[PDB]
Design a binder for this molecule. Sequence first.
Ligand SMILES: COc1ccc2c3c1Oc1ccc(O)cc1C=C3N(C)C2=O
Length: 123
Amino acid sequence: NPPPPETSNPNKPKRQTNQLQYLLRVVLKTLWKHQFAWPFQQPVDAVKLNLPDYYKIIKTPMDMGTIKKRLENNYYWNAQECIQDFNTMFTNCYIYNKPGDDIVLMAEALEKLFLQKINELPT
Ligand SMILES: COc1ccc2c3c1Oc1ccc(O)cc1C=C3N(C)C2=O
């Protein structure tokens, strides 16, 4: 396993915004309870899950546990930075797998719920 993505960085510029607050309270915490969220709540453990090729293929890993920690730690500058992490998470799943896989069906459903939730954000 590589080290997991950072969740703090003292030199990184950070901000507290209504949209980032909403991404934690509403978007992340709603996705988290979905029946399909569980593969995405923690970094992929390639040793535990017996996927020795995972980090051979996925070079920018991302997961909702990391995102949740980043939001709780005030890691982001703006909502777009957070949204990019979700997009990276979903794309990683499509890249490492293929159409029709169970994990991909899960990511597809979550991504559609995610887009529904960020379609309108607070001002
Ligand atoms: C062979 O099972 C797979 C195959 C691919 C993927 C996953 C798989 O299973 C998991 C099992 C437990 C868990 O903690 C996370 C996952 C998340 C996965 N992601 C994100 C994948 O792309």
